[PDB]
Amino acid sequence: YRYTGKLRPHYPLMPTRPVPSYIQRPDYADHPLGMSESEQALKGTSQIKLLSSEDIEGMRLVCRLAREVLDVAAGMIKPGVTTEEIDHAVHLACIARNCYPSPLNYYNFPKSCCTSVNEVICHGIPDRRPLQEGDIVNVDITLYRNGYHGDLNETFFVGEVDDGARKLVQTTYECLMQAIDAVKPGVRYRELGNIIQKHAQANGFSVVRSYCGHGIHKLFHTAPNVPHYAKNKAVGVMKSGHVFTIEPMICEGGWQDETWPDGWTAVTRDGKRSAQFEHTLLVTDTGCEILTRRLDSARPHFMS
Ligand SMILES: CO[C@@H](C(=O)NCC(N)=O)[C@H](O)[C@@H](O)[C@H](O)/C=C/C(C)(C)C
Numbered sequence: 001y002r003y004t005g006k007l008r009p010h011y012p013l014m015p016t017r018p019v020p021s022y023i024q025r026p027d028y029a030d031h032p033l034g035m036s037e038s039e040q041a042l043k044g045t046s047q048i049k050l051l052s053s054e055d056i057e058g059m060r061l062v063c064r065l066a067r068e069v070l071d072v073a074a075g076m077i078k079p080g081v082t083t084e085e086i087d088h089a090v091h092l093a094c095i096a097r098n099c100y101p102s103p104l105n106y107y108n109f110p111k112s113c114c115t116s117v118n119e120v121i122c123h124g125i126p127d128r129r130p131l132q133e134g135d136i137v138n139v140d141i142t143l144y145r146n147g148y149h150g151d152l153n154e155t156f157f158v159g160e161v162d163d164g165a166r167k168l169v170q171t172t173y174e175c176l177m178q179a180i181d182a183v184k185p186g187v188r189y190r191e192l193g194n195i196i197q198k199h200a201q202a203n204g205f206s207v208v209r210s211y212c213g214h215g216i217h218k219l220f221h222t223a224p225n226v227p228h229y230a231k232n233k234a235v236g237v238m239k240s241g242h243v244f245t246i247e248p249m250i251c252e253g254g255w256q257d258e259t260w261p262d263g264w265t266a267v268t269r270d271g272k273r274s275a276q277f278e279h280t281l282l283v284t285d286t287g288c289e290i291l292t293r294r295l296d297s298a299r300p301h302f303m304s
Pocket residue numbers: 102103104106109114122123140141142151210211212213214221247278
């Protein structure tokens with residue numbers, strides 16, 4: 001394998017962490033390949049669920065607990081902390097909230113969250129690498145409570161970063177927020193990619209095509225598919241009651257990705273940096289409710 005940049009995996013990984021059996025588990029948790037039979041049963045469908053009141057309440061709770069766990073991870077971001085150490089804290093913070101960490105064994109993903117540094121676009125596997133001053137690192141958290149998943153991520157700076165890191169991260173967060181600002185009933189899912197690509201291209205960045213936002217509720221990934229690039233052909237129109245994520249991945253270089261031999265870590269094929277942000281959204285009559293927002297602070301962590 002020819003690495004595309006300076007990052008390397010740092011092995012061995014710690015043994016898989018158990019979740020106590022008192023925590024309710026999603027269907028894939030005990031499937032030997034991590035497959036989710038409830039997702040597979042819906043595979044080739046474009047139909048979108050209209051959430052009940054009870055469903056909305058379940059989504060509000062799990063998304064609120066997921067933001068609390070991202071904040072725990074945010075507080076740990078400093079030089080010399082390993083991504084494994086972050087994952088261990090996240091795994092304990094999920095169990096403290098009586099939640100299962102949704103990534104753990106999802107299609108055999110081996111950890112409780114994803115930690116993506118620099119050229120990693122997404123799905124990086126927490127490991128023994130200590131964070132370096134100048135890194136950008138994204139932590140992506142998903143929790144499962146009472147049958148509902150809630151998903152969010154932010155990119156953080158490790159100590160002092162360079163101007164290019166600051167622009168990429170800011171522009172990425174602005175792409176997510178301009179897309180959220182357009183959400184309201186009657187809007188097509190395919191329009192959000194136009195908004196995102198327009199702002200990314202104005203700042204000299206590209207938009208990852210291989211990875212997308214998604215419906216989420218009782219399934220971790222379900223309709224709709226939500227591409228982040230322009231002129232995509234995604235199916236569907238927003239309606240009040242729909243819940244989905246928007247999670248754009250924006251890159252310094254070209255948009256092309258490839259995956260490491262571990263089968264999960266997605267990296268820029270040019271080795272340049274990529275950043276991401278994610279929220280879980282509910283469509284409401286006035287626009288949308290950002291279920292994974294912060295409640296006690298105005299800005300994402302990178303701005304403090
Ligand atoms: C971009 O990643 C998203 C995704 O795969 N989107 C669907 C798609 N087909 O591109 C995904 O939802 C992430 O947000 C989630 O945190 C990570 C989940 C794993 C347990 C699969 C690593």
